[PDB]
Enzyme design. Structure first.
Site, PDB file in Angstrom:
ATOM      1  N   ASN A   9       0.993  -1.036   0.019  1.00  0.00           N
ATOM      2  CA  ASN A   9       0.068  -0.128   0.179  1.00  0.00           C
ATOM      3  C   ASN A   9       0.932   1.333   0.215  1.00  0.00           C
ATOM      4  O   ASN A   9       1.397   1.590   1.079  1.00  0.00           O
ATOM      5  CB  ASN A   9      -1.025  -0.067   1.249  1.00  0.00           C
ATOM      6  CG  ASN A   9      -1.890   1.214   1.154  1.00  0.00           C
ATOM      7  OD1 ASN A   9      -1.834   1.896   0.250  1.00  0.00           O
ATOM      8  ND2 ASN A   9      -2.688   1.444   2.266  1.00  0.00           N
ATOM      9  N   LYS A  11      -0.048   4.067  -0.773  1.00  0.00           N
ATOM     10  CA  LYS A  11      -0.815   5.253   0.240  1.00  0.00           C
ATOM     11  C   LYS A  11      -0.522   6.425  -1.024  1.00  0.00           C
ATOM     12  O   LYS A  11      -0.568   6.295  -2.280  1.00  0.00           O
ATOM     13  CB  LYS A  11      -0.359   5.414   1.438  1.00  0.00           C
ATOM     14  CG  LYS A  11      -0.691   4.512   2.616  1.00  0.00           C
ATOM     15  CD  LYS A  11      -0.476   5.076   3.876  1.00  0.00           C
ATOM     16  CE  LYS A  11      -0.731   3.534   4.641  1.00  0.00           C
ATOM     17  NZ  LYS A  11      -0.538   3.637   6.131  1.00  0.00           N
ATOM     18  N   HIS A  94      -9.874   0.927   4.557  1.00  0.00           N
ATOM     19  CA  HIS A  94      -8.789   1.306   5.047  1.00  0.00           C
ATOM     20  C   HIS A  94      -9.054   2.376   6.345  1.00  0.00           C
ATOM     21  O   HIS A  94      -9.785   3.255   5.942  1.00  0.00           O
ATOM     22  CB  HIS A  94      -7.779   1.959   4.185  1.00  0.00           C
ATOM     23  CG  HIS A  94      -6.116   1.963   4.721  1.00  0.00           C
ATOM     24  ND1 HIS A  94      -5.617   2.953   5.341  1.00  0.00           N
ATOM     25  CD2 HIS A  94      -5.182   1.072   4.425  1.00  0.00           C
ATOM     26  CE1 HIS A  94      -4.525   2.834   5.885  1.00  0.00           C
ATOM     27  NE2 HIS A  94      -4.063   1.780   5.438  1.00  0.00           N
ATOM     28  N   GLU A  96      -7.492   5.155   7.092  1.00  0.00           N
ATOM     29  CA  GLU A  96      -7.484   6.362   6.833  1.00  0.00           C
ATOM     30  C   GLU A  96      -8.426   6.943   6.153  1.00  0.00           C
ATOM     31  O   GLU A  96      -8.903   8.084   6.465  1.00  0.00           O
ATOM     32  CB  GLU A  96      -5.900   6.491   6.085  1.00  0.00           C
ATOM     33  CG  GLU A  96      -4.788   6.465   6.930  1.00  0.00           C
ATOM     34  CD  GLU A  96      -3.798   5.937   6.287  1.00  0.00           C
ATOM     35  OE1 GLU A  96      -3.673   5.888   4.989  1.00  0.00           O
ATOM     36  OE2 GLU A  96      -2.609   5.426   6.985  1.00  0.00           O
ATOM     37  N   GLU A 164      -6.312  -4.413  11.048  1.00  0.00           N
ATOM     38  CA  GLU A 164      -5.452  -3.244  11.242  1.00  0.00           C
ATOM     39  C   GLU A 164      -5.629  -2.933  12.687  1.00  0.00           C
ATOM     40  O   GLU A 164      -6.753  -2.385  13.048  1.00  0.00           O
ATOM     41  CB  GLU A 164      -5.927  -2.110  10.376  1.00  0.00           C
ATOM     42  CG  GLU A 164      -5.938  -2.162   8.693  1.00  0.00           C
ATOM     43  CD  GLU A 164      -6.064  -1.081   8.015  1.00  0.00           C
ATOM     44  OE1 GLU A 164      -7.323  -0.569   8.393  1.00  0.00           O
ATOM     45  OE2 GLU A 164      -5.188  -0.642   7.218  1.00  0.00           O
ATOM     46  N   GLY A 170       1.602   3.065  11.005  1.00  0.00           N
ATOM     47  CA  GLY A 170       2.344   3.969  11.037  1.00  0.00           C
ATOM     48  C   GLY A 170       3.149   4.452  12.229  1.00  0.00           C
ATOM     49  O   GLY A 170       3.650   5.403  12.460  1.00  0.00           O
ATOM     50  N   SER A 210       2.504  -1.482  10.668  1.00  0.00           N
ATOM     51  CA  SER A 210       3.903  -1.403  11.081  1.00  0.00           C
ATOM     52  C   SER A 210       4.391  -3.056  10.748  1.00  0.00           C
ATOM     53  O   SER A 210       5.169  -3.388  11.646  1.00  0.00           O
ATOM     54  CB  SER A 210       4.231  -1.304  12.349  1.00  0.00           C
ATOM     55  OG  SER A 210       3.562   0.290  12.529  1.00  0.00           O
TER      56      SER A 210
END
Lengths: 247, 247
Positions: A9, A11, A94, A96, A164, A170, A210
């Site tokens: 990904n 991003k 996702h 985000e 997730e 991150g 991560s």
């Protein structure tokens, strides 16, 4: 029996030049795509560039898809447009997108439905916050999230789930191989109890949050972790070693 | 003495074959790009295909940009990324993004800022609903919407305004060249009061309700209407006749 699935990904990152350099590094790794799925998710406007540069063993997709079909939806990419372009994968739900653009479980469901209707493969993301985890609500939260869309799965090779931990995205604070395993086992059970045991045994459940060169081997070794959705580490040439861990 | 500006907003529409056919018919039209701006906005994943197919006389852009720069924003396309691709235009604040994806005046401000910082040209959209018009709040709403971003404009060739009369979209009511002209005049005064008189005379203000081959000439001939953002009519070969109305 389950085919491992390693996804990049990217991003909102990359230039034409950086992608040229990165894809060239990736291309140096020889692997059998019939044994292992390796999927790269570039920015939409980078898709054609990325597809042309990546060798055919690599699969590709886009980082989001519309909940609507073709029509008056300015800024959206419909599942039917993606299929016409032979885009194979989509990322849905996702963290985000749920956070910044307030995508709901219902949005996730509608995007999955449109994707499946148009014969796209979907990488479907969910996971609990730190708050929810400290309140011992992780199973409850995950169950609700999975149940929002899971009845839609018509082919259990073509839908891939991603756990997730939101606190793991991150942050460097990756869930221990054992912490993720426990959730993955619970996710597969939810799929078993709602879709069937054979269906649960064929569905890929990935860990996201991560993943790097140093923790990928311990994660993939877990019985119910079938690969990764890799964020930051997939922007590096060392992403080849993460792919290697699933070989 | 303003340069006219005709934009095709394809929205979420098109296949590879339909675009091949459509762009070819468009290329048939002999116009001078120094006299008239003609911009087509394909779906993000269609951008490269569309850019290659269209002759250089046509400008191109994308239908939305991120308020965030590069980084961990899955599914977003940054202004920096568009810059690297030499994507010339962006649409910001289209009502479908305001309606379906809750885009705010603040989001519009930030997206414009991002675009200008990265030397992108922006087509910025606003307009009032049916309920706002019927409460006689048209000029109050437009003023609030325009004043959300207008002070950011540093080059008045590079930002193009679009009046979208939401009161005349899916309602039963109809917009008239006179109704549009009056709003356009009011928009230009807002620009005059905030940015200066020479700047207000320079800036393009497009009509963005339903435009077709029949009504285009009646609209463009209005003193303060400098072109159009065209939706579904821009998906047809007859779109060239809409372009011809501004030649």
């Amino acid at each position: 029996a389950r085919k491992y699935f390693v996804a990049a990904n990217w991003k909102c990152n990359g230039t034409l030049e950086s992608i040229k350099s990165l894809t060239n590094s990736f291309n140096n790794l020889d692997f059998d795509p019939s044994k292992l799925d390796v999927v790269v998710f570039p920015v939409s406007v980078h898709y054609d560039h990325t597809r042309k540069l990546l060798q055919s063993k690599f699969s590709t997709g886009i980082q989001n898809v519309s909940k609507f079909g073709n029509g008056s939806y300015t800024g959206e990419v419909s599942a039917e447009i993606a299929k016409d372009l032979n885009i194979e994968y989509v990322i849905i739900g996702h963290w985000e997108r749920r956070k910044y653009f307030h995508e709901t479980d219902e949005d996730v469901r509608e995007k999955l439905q449109a994707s499946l209707k148009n014969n796209l493969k979907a990488v479907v993301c969910f996971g609990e916050s730190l708050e929810q985890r400290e309140q011992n609500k992780t199973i409850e939260v995950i169950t609700k999230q999975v149940k929002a869309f899971v009845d839609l799965i018509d082919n259990f090779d073509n839908v891939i789930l991603v756990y997730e931990p939101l606190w793991a995205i991150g942050t460097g604070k990756t869930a221990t191989p054992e912490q993720a395993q426990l959730v993955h086992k619970e996710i597969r059970k939810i799929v078993k109890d709602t879709c069937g045991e054979k269906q649960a045994n064929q569905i890929r459940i990935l860990y996201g949050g991560s993943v790097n060169t140093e923790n990928c081997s311990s994660l993939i070794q877990q019985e119910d972790i079938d690969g990764f959705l890799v964020g930051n580490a997939s922007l590096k040439e060392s992403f080849v070693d993460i792919i290697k861990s699933a070989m």
